[PDB]
Structure formats: structure tokens, C-alpha cells
């Protein structure tokens, strides 16, 4: 009993700082974050579809409300993809190290670690869902972009001139958000949480 806990499951531990936080693990990981954005651009759109809504709305706060709501729902497609890509390297790493042949042990040893991944793949994915639904409850105006008055990531002309600038931004701009926000999520959750678990939840329960 002593042998496995002491050597088999502790050198593997140092294995894990190694693999996750380092191509090797170092920039296998980084890779996924800066190739993720490409996904976003493709299966999303902005500009003139949103633009049409403006005219009816005005006849500024009252006008804004209906406009943005219906587009935001469609941002689901890309975001999910990032999550899965993360899973590949991490889920398979933990399990690689656990058998080390004998008669008594193993079984238990697996049971503690594997089930973690199930619970934590749900975290990240769920955070994506929430974020998307959020849009229809809010449509804030404090945010970030420029002022009024590839997807970016008779004298009627004078009348709409001013109003126009307000609405248009929010669709285009939201794309900027998702591309950075998804990766950030992963870092906390997918990556770190699991990294921790396997190192230690295994050992303590064993020895006792």
C-alpha cells in the first residue's frame, strides 16, 4: 500500500504543475486563447440589420430598448467552442498517471478524480449561457466604445444624424467582449480548478 501513494501518485503530482502550466504544455495552452477569436468573427454579424430598427423607435431611451434585444441571442454559436478545446488536453492528462498493475487498489483511486471533470465542465459552460441571456435584461449605456453625436472586433439625413450613432455601436462592440471574456473564464475554471483537484483530493482520502 505504501508504495503507490509515496511514489506513483506524488511524482505524478509534480507532473501536473508541469503539464498544465508548462509544443509542450506551456504554449499548447496559450495557443488556444489566441486562435479562439477567429471562431467568434465568422459565425456572428452586426451593422445594418440592427440599423433599420432605429427609425420607428424614436417616434432616445424609449427607442433604444426594443432595438438591441433580438440580436444578442445569436452570439451563442462561437462561445461554446472554446470550452471544448480546453477539455481535450486536461481531461486526458489526469487519467494518464493513475494505474502505474497489482490486485487491491486502483478502482477507488480512479473514482475520486474522474468525476471532478464532469462537475467542472458544467461550470464553465453554464457561465457562458448566463452571460448570453443577460443581454436581454440590461442593454446598458455607461460602457465602453466612442460617443454619439471580418466583423469588427428630403432632408432625412440631418434628422437621424444624431440618434444613429448610439444604437449602432452596441452590436459591433459586443463581439470585442466575447473574444476576450471566454478565455478569461477558462483560466479560472477549466484550467485551474482541475489542475488543483487531481494533485490532492486523491491522496488524502487514500491514506486515511
Amino acid at each position: 500500500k505504501t508504495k503507490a501513494l509515496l511514489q506513483m501518485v506524488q511524482q505524478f503530482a509534480v507532473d501536473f504543475e508541469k503539464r498544465i502550466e508548462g509544443s509542450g504544455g506551456a504554449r499548447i495552452n496559450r495557443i488556444f486563447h489566441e486562435r479562439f477569436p477567429f471562431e467568434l468573427v465568422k459565425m456572428e454579424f452586426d451593422e445594418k440589420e440592427l440599423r433599420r430598427e432605429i427609425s420607428y423607435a424614436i417616434k432616445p431611451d424609449m427607442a433604444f430598448e426594443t432595438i438591441v434585444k433580438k440580436q444578442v441571442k445569436k452570439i451563442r454559436e462561437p462561445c461554446l467552442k472554446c470550452v471544448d478545446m480546453v477539455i481535450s488536453e486536461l481531461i486526458s492528462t489526469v487519467r494518464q498517471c493513475t494505474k502505474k498493475q497489482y490486485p487491491r487498489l486502483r478502482e477507488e483511486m480512479e473514482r475520486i478524480v474522474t468525476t471532478h471533470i464532469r462537475e467542472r465542465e458544467g461550470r464553465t459552460k453554464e457561465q457562458v449561457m448566463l452571460l448570453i441571456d443577460i443581454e436581454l435584461a440590461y442593454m446598458n449605456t455607461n460602457h465602453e466604445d466612442f460617443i454619439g453625436f471580418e466583423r469588427v472586433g428630403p432632408q432625412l439625413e440631418r434628422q437621424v444624424e444624431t440618434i444613429r450613432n448610439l444604437v449602432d455601436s452596441y452590436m459591433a462592440i459586443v463581439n470585442k467582449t466575447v473574444r476576450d471574456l471566454m478565455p478569461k473564464t477558462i483560466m479560472h475554471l477549466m484550467i485551474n480548478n482541475t489542475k488543483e483537484f487531481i494533485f490532492s483530493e486523491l491522496l488524502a482520502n487514500l491514506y486515511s
Copy 2:
């Protein structure tokens, strides 16, 4: 009764398109709109007070989320106040009108009049309220103020990188919003609603 309603109580009616919609409502109103901004400045704040909240979170999206809460709630004070200033002189004009002598007749005459407009002075305020409550919820990043990475307008790399630039400017800009939006608002609502009053409700009960 058909003759009496048709003539006697419809000539009184026409009086009121005149004053309010083309002092009365016409130019009482203008005055209040351009002294309104002063209201705004007083019971509102920005800058480094807001920064205090940040320290609790940091010491990325989820942590940032809480910040504004109690501040956005406090922007009610000025906007609401404008409403009352308009109401005072204009609402009281219609209500004066029911005494125009017989003591048998007067008692019935009074009771019918006041109520409808009374409740619909509330309407106007409520639309302002909607915009305000909205504020508290999310704060993603695209809207006006500047990006991370008259009102003015270790692993640091993920966390603090964005946080720093956003917070301070952020509050200031929403103040910008209100000051212009209120005056517009009034034009549609206050003005017309009350106009209706005398024109019709006076007649109304008598038909039965």
C-alpha cells in the same frame, strides 16, 4: 341633455389646446428645462469614491460586476425633481375650473373632476425610473467611456489590466445621459396628458 352637453360644455374645452400646446404650460416649461442641469450636479458623484468598491473584488468580469450598485440608484434625485417643477403650475390650472355658483349644483360638480390626471402625473416619472433601475446588473465593456488594457466625457495581465481604466471615468458619463433625455421626455408626456383633462372629463359623468 344632448343639447346641453354638446354646446355649453364644449366651448370651455377649446381654451386649453391654446395655452399648453399652442404662465401656463407653454413657457413655464421652457424655463425649467435649462435650469434643470443644476439639479443634476448637486445630488450626484463620480471618481475616486467609486474606486473603493474595486478593492474588495480585486484584493475579472464577476468581480467588476458589483461596483456601481448604490450610485446608479442615487441618480434618481435630480431627474424626478424636474417633473415636479413642471407639474406645480400646470396641473393646478385645470382643477380651478369647477366653481364657474349655485350651492345645490356645486357639490355634485366638484367630486367628478380631479382624479384622472392626478394618477397620470405618476406615469411620466415611472418611465424615468425604468432607465435608472436597469443600471445595476452587468457592465460588460463597449458603450461610451474608454477601454482598459457638464460631466466629464503578478497575473496583472488578466485581472487588473482592464479594471483600472474603466472604473473612474465610468460614473461620469451616465450623468451626461440624463441631463439631455429628461427635457426630451417631457415634451411627449407631461404636456399632452394634462391638456386632455378639461376638454373631456368635465362632460363625462353627466352622460351616465
Copy 3:
């Protein structure tokens, strides 16, 4: 009983500022006023028929009297049309909102509002009639146009030279009048009067 008065017949009220005074109601309404003039031009005439009368008359005040009288009667045709066009949007709006299904109520509720339109379509039309008859009693000279000495909207030559300019104006000129005067009428009466009524004559009688 409470439900209908409170909600069904009060949100409809705000409905009415909306619909009348705003294509939507805003420029559905304006439309009718500036397309009305076309009606006038067609079914009216001036110039040389009137011109013939002058010569007998002189052999200036005495001459003028007989001349203009007989033409003015014929201006009836266009004027009426405007009235009806106004009716269409307004008469149908009020009734759209009144049923909201139940057993007790409704009946009464209709009875108060509908009959108003009958009485007020008579106002406007009657004002048109009066205005037309008026001409044969007056033929004033103070008015507006230029001085003496598509429908606009031997040495005999020296003798009629001066007189001529006086009479000729009045027919041509009257057309200018009607095109603007009819719309003005409507604004006060058709439009506003009815707008008022429905908002309020309904409610008060109900609650009591």
C-alpha cells in the same frame, strides 16, 4: 368591475395621445392637410367668366356688387372632402379599445363615446356651409392680394384699364383662402375635440 376601469380603459387613454398626435399617427395626420389643396384646384375656376361682368356694372362700388356674388356658391365642391378624410382615422381609433369579453358592462361603455362622433362631424361640416354662404352678404374690399391701378392659389383699352384690376382679383384669390382655412378648422374641431372626449367622458360616468 375594478379591473376594466383601472387598466383596460386607462392604458388605452395614453393610446390616444399617442395615436392622434403621433406612417404612424404623427404624419398620417399631417399628410391629409398638405394633399388637401390638390382637391381645391381641380373642381374650381376663376378669370374671364367673372371678367365679362365688369363693363355693364360701371355704367366702382355700385359696379362691384353684382359681379362677384354668383361665383362663390360653386366653391362648395372641394371643401367638404377634407372633413371626411379626417373622419376615417379618428372615428375608428376610439372604438378599437373598448371591449378589452365578460357579462355585465360593455354596452354602456360604448354608448357614451360613439355618439360624440355624430355630434362633432356635424360641427366641422356646418362651419364649411356657413363660410360659403357668407360671401353673398359681404364682398369686402379691405382684404389681402395686390392693389388696382392649375387655378391660381376704339380706345376702349384705356377706359376699362383702371376698373379692371379691382374685380378680377377676388375670384382668383378666394381659392388661396379655402385651401388653408379648411385644414385649420379640422385641427380645432375634428381632431382635438374628439381626442379629448374619449380619454375622459367615459371614465367618470362609470365609476360613479
Copy 4:
């Protein structure tokens, strides 16, 4: 009696074509016509007094309608006065003529003479009166003076737009009318009517 009427009382007759129609009527008349205008200026007014009436109405056609009333009535004074000036010297010529000795004859002779012309001095004035009374009634907009939107010659958009330009000029121009019209008038009427007098009525009663 046939012989007496035919000769004795017809040579007296012929005298009068002479003086009046080709001092007597001929050139008494001319003098009075070109000093007549002075009369006009005195007992008449225009400009800003008239504006007072406007304030009652406004603070569009119906309101404008009342204005002129009492002013147009006051334009009688000058026009009428001219009449009397002509009458004085000319009317009294015929009436002198009945004394031309026998005391038995004179008494019958006088009574027959005066009356007919007497009443028909009234005629002339009355035709002037007609034009004057007319004034009060309507005031639509085309005639001479300028449009909205020697005598000189909120929802503002519907109401005051037209009103402003009309009122002030308006009174002035009617004064223009009278000053020229009176002199013409006289030529037809005064002159001829009285001429008749002596030529025939002298004979008249005697035939029986």
C-alpha cells in the same frame, strides 16, 4: 290752361340745364371735391389702437372676425359730410323761384314746390351708407393689404402666423377707397337729380 301751361311755364324750365349740368352746381361742386380729402383724415384712425382687439381673441378665422367692428362704422363721418357741402348752395336755388307777386296767387303757389327734391337729397347719402355697413361681417384674406405668414397703402404656426401681418395695415386701406369713390358718386347722383326739379314739378300740380 293748355296754352298757359305749355308756354308760360316751360321757358322758365330751360334755364336749369344750363347752370347745373351745362356759384351754381357746376363749379361750386369742383371746389368741394378736392378739399373733401381733408375731411377724411380728421375723424378716422388706423394702426395700433386696432391691435388691442386682437389680444382678446388670440389670448383663427373666428377670432380674427370680430376686430374691425366699431372702426368701419366711424368712416361715415367724412363721406356724409361731403354731401351736405354740395347740397347747401345748389338745393336752395330751385326753392327761391316761386315768388316770381299777387297775394291771392302766391299762397297756393308756394305749397306745391319744395318737397320732392328734399327727400331725394337723402338718396345719395344712403348709397354711401350701404358700402360702410358691409364692412363689419367677415374679413377672409385676399383683397388689397399684405398677406400673413393719403392713407398708407407654441402653436404659433396656425394661430398668430397669419394674424400679425394683416391687422395693422388693414384699416388704412379702406380710407383709400372712400376718398376717390365719393367724388365719382356725386357726378351721377347729386347733380342730375336736382336739375329735374324746376323743369317739371312747377307745372305739375296745376294740371290736376
Copy 5:
């Protein structure tokens, strides 16, 4: 198992009343296996009823597709037996088996023709039991030479049902890697939480082979491991040998074989019984969230009809209203265990 029974039945009735998809789809249990697995003995052991044709070698000699249907008339109907209705489940067994034995002899004669019978009873749960003929590689008795192919396709039409508890029985005197019993069975119910590999008739194996690594649970570790069984021979079955007897014959083999002796305490049918139940509970519970959401929406609907009574001048609702309330409550309680 203590949460599962009561909660499931209660939910199922409420859904039935609403005319919805009741669901809570209880497993169909079927035995498939190579020739000489014992399969009907295994199936009847778990189910608890005697109604399956039994024999040695090839056991199921006609398909019995039995459907238990809760219904008020209480009878059963054979298509091919015009004018028979059994109410007694024992009687079903007696007629099927006895009539075959008298007419075919006791030399393994089989028939592919399924017996369509539906047993109506108010004392049962809505279940489907399917006894299936064994897939084979070599004929015995008067079986045709191409028996192998006919049986294999036939059984697949019934076994595709996703919630099919297969007790994959495979004769040790045939190669386990080339076993039809394992090939079919593992496809339909892979997980191994409720499949436990049962190898019979180890006494008939060729000298020089054994299943030692598999049966010892060390080559391929399973949570519950393996349990072998030694099923009743032809002679015993003929005399209506009772349920207990099969168990006894199992012991005798194990004692003399050196390679299986030490694993004797993790053997027997009874032990196999225990495992199956525990897994079942988990499956039901997971489907719960979906049902709940649908129920909520429907209820509100009819409120509007009441709503419209009250304002403008001139029992399906009730029944449904009540039913919905019930269903929602049950769902939550099962979720919290």
C-alpha cells in the same frame, strides 16, 4: 432502491391523467447468449416468475414476447391459439412447455416462430419481458445447419430498446472472443454497471483452456466483477424442477477446479440480483428536470378564460388544473432524494 419504487409509481399515474408522456420507462430484461448459456434460467431467476421454456444447451425453443399491460378485463390472448385465455401465469408455463415436449421429444428441437401473448393483469407494473433463443455456431439435435444466422437477426429487433438489461451469458466451451453472446450484448448495454458477465458450463471446456484472467476480475476490472453459474441439465428440467435447484449444481464444479476455487465467495445468482437494483435508480432521476418545466406552463393557460368574463357588454379546464399541481411536487422530492 428505497427512494425509487414509491416515487416512480406516483409520478407515472399523474402523467397518465394529463394525457402526456408518462415516461419513467422501466427496463425490459432479456437474456441473450451463445448455445448452452442457460439463458431462460437466468432470466426467470431475476424476474421471479416461472413462465419461460427451459432446457439444456439451447433453451428458448420458441420466442415468448410477453407484454404485461395493466387492464381491467384480466385475460391473455394467443394469436395462434384461437380461443385460449389464461389468467394464471403458472398455467402459461405449463401449456407452452408440456405441449412442446410431448411433440418434439427431448432432443433440442427448436422453432423461430414467436408466440404473441399479452397478459392483462391489474397486479403488475408496466414491463416488457423478452425471452430470446440462443445465437449459435454449431447445430444440435434436429436443428438446421444454418441456425446461426436466423436467430441472430431475430433477437436484435427486440434488444435495440435502449434500456435493455442484458445478462450476457456465454458458454465456456466456445471461445469468448468469438462469442455471439458478448458481441450483441455489449453493443446494447456497454456500461458494465448492470452487465455482469456470466460464463456457464466450465466443466465442458476443452482440456488446455480456461477463463482465469477474466473471471478473477484482474485482466479487466469491473466494479462488481464476475459471477459464473452452472445451469440445470436436461434431465432435471423435464420433471418441473423448481427454481432453487439450479443454484445447487453451481457449487460442485467450483470446488475441484484449482483456478476458480478462491473466487467462490463472489459467485451465485443471488449476488447478481443485488447489483442490478442499485444502478436502476440513477437512470430515472436524471430525466426529471425536463418533465417539470413542461407541467408549469400548461396550468396558467386557462386562467385567461376566467379573466375575460368580467368586462364588456353582451370542465376540461378544471380537470387538468388539478392534475398538473400533483406532478410538479413529486418531481422535486425525488431530486432531493
Copy 6:
């Protein structure tokens, strides 16, 4: 010699058990020589057994390739004598010699055809003895004229074996420089530590020649020098003359020849015996280091199998393990003498 015997046998058995190259390859002893060397007499003198055909002049008149093989059945097999098995080594000699003598006469008749015999006995060491016909230059008796070439090639197929102790016997009545006996022999075993040049039949030399310088050990000094011998004539051999007798005839010549008298005390077969043994020991010992290293590695291997038992959830080894231990110990002790 006292370290060599025991240590060698002990090592050889341990290696046999492991199924490795036992080695410790004991010398094959073969006599080669010109015509009239005596060669079989010399070979049997050292070996200690009577089994070689003997004669004067040409001696080996058929090849006897004998292989001693330790084996349990105890017999021997002639290819050309279908259905004879000797167990008695004396009997082998008796049959070969007697049967030839009766049929060919006593006039030197020879035969190149080897006699394939393998003597199985448990009382022997794994050795190969090879008696070979003498290479010649002139025929005698009824030998063919081209005898010279046939014998020479034949003997070379057996004598190439690197550890072949050649007692290079050369007749003095032929020129030593032109001697076939020395040419072959010196090629295969050059060193001279275990080759001692034996010159026979000095009594038949031509008048006017002698081997004085060579035999005196002064021309070409050797550590053990030279030993001459005078072998048995034809007449003696015929009557089964015993082993001792050859030695006696040696003396007679030496006494009358002036040039060899003084070297008499460094003569005889017995003296030749002593030298051979001492050299042999050295050869074995040097090969020891290589064997040792291989043995160590193999042992460890199976430890890992034991290792893997203890940790992860579901007699060849023994035999070898013991054998290896033995071999390593023996190697060291021999090295330290």
C-alpha cells in the same frame, strides 16, 4: 591442475541449467603426423584408453571420429554397422582392429572412410577425440600412389578446432623441413607450450643425417624442449601388446647413438604427460570475466513482475532465479585461484 578440475565441472553444470552457452570448452586431442610416426600409440598413451587402431608405419587405417556424450541410455551407434551397440570401450577396440586385420592382412592396407561412432556414457566428461590417418609422401603395401593428397585435406576438417592439442609426431627417416606432420600441426597450435616435437624411428634414418641441433634443444629453445619416442613395430601390435610395452623399445636406440645419449633423462612419454596439464588451466581462467557479467543482468529482470502486483484496481521466474546465483559465485573463486 588442482584448481582446474573441480572448478570447471561445477561451472559447466550451472550454465547448462540456465540454457546458456556453458562453454569451458575442453581440448580435443588429435595426433597428426608423417607416415611412420606411431601416432595412435601417442594419442592413446595420453588419453588413457585402448580404442585406437594401431600399426607400424601407417597406423590409423580408418578414421575413428569418436564423440563422448553424457547421456542416460548408455550405448553407441555405428552408421555403417546397422544394429550394433557397444557399451564397453574395450569391445570397440577389439571389433575395429580384429575385423580389419583378418580381411586386409598385415601389409598396411588403409581406407579413408571415417567410422562414425558416438559413445554414450554417464561416466565421462564432454570431450571429442579424433584419431587421424598419417599424411604421407610415399605409399607402402597396397596403398594407392596418390595417397599423399587424400589424407591431408581430410584431417584438416577436424583439426581446425582452435583448442586442438596436437602431438606433432614426425618420422626421422623423412626430412623435417619438408615434413607434412609439422606443417599442419604448427599452424593449428603454434605456441609450443603444449606442443612438444616428437621424432620417432631414428634407427631408420639414412646414414649421414641426424636431428642433433633440434633434439638437443639448442638451435631453437623451447620451454619443455624435445622428447623422442620409439614406437611399437607391426609384430608386437598384432598380439594385442599392452600399453606399457611401447616405452621399453624407446630405450634401446638411445644408448648406442653418440649424438642423443646425453639427452636421455628428458625423454619418454611419461614426461610429455606432465607438461600438457599445466598449460591447460591458464586457458580456462581468462574466459571467466565475460561469463560473469551476462549472469548478473538476467536475474534482476523478473523482480519487476513482483513489483507490479501491489497497486492498481481490477515458475520459469523461480527456476532461473536460483540457477543464476550459483554461477556467479563459482566464477569469482576460480579467478582468485
Copy 7:
């Protein structure tokens, strides 16, 4: 006051001393016939009274291709300057005819042929 017509006509009998026959811009009204150097009217060649103006068919005129007609005052010798008649010439007969009818209207009457 009213313009009856504006159209070019060639004054065919302009001296050597003034360029020769040049085209000038005619403007006729009911009271006068005025001609300028062009239609901007900054110039003023003259203004001829229509009073007592009469019109004649001028029998070919010079020995040229011009068709001539003339205006002449019935009550005096010269019509303007030292001319007797105002000679108007066109390169085609149709140009000459249309202008002749326009003079009719203005009080230039026919006869004296």
C-alpha cells in the same frame, strides 16, 4: 408695357461708316418699337414712336437676296434719323412675314402701297 415679340432682324441699310448691315435685337410693344445691341438692354440704339406708323410691302428692295418691308410715319418725311423708312431684312421669306403681322397689332396699319 406688354412685349409683343422679341426677335432678331437685320438692319439692311446701315451705312458704310457703322460696320454695314448688322443684326440687331428688336423689342416691340403696343406703344414703341425699340432696338438694342442685345437682350441685356444696356445700350439703346433708339426708340421710334408707333404713332402714325403704317406698313408697306417693299418690292424686293436693293438687288440682293433680302426680302424687305418698312415702317413709315404717315405725317412726316423721315421715320428715324435720316431714313424715310426703316428697312428690315431677313435671309428667308418666312422670317419677314411673321414680324410683319406683329407690327399690325401694335397700331402699324396696312395700305399706302
Copy 8:
């Protein structure tokens, strides 16, 4: 604000006194048509109001190889300086045409042909 087009055009009627016909760099927007000596815009030849600007097909122009067109203010005499119309000339007909359509967009409308 928005640039409609930038492209060279030849001012064909520049006086003797200023080099003669030279090519100048045109910049048209929705509010003005400005032209510089070059694209660096350090210069400023002018800024002409687009207000009341209208466009005509200029019938060949001078007796040259240039194809001309012009901008002219409907409410006044000169368009800029002392010109009446702004003459733009190209060596080819295709150059003239593409610029004419770009003026259309800017509120220079057709007619008055």
C-alpha cells in the same frame, strides 16, 4: 464631411495672366467642392458653395478637343470670381462623364439645358 471623390480636372478657362489651362486637384463632398494645387492641401484655390448648384451639358465649348461641362448657381450670375460657369475639361470623354455623376450626388441637379 464624406469625400465623394478625389480626381484631377483641367480648368480650361483660366486666363493668360495665370499660366493658362492647368490641371488642379478636385475634392467634392456633400456640402462643398474645393480644389487645391495638390493633395497635401496647403494651398486653397477656393471653396464654392454647392447650394443652388445645377449642372448642364456644355455643347463642345471652345473650338478645341476638350469636352466641357459646367456648374452654375441658379440664383446668381457668376459661380465663382468673375465666371458665370466653372468649365471643367478632360482630354477624353470618359473622364468628363464619371465626374458629372459624382456632382449629381452632392446636390447639383440636372436640367436648365
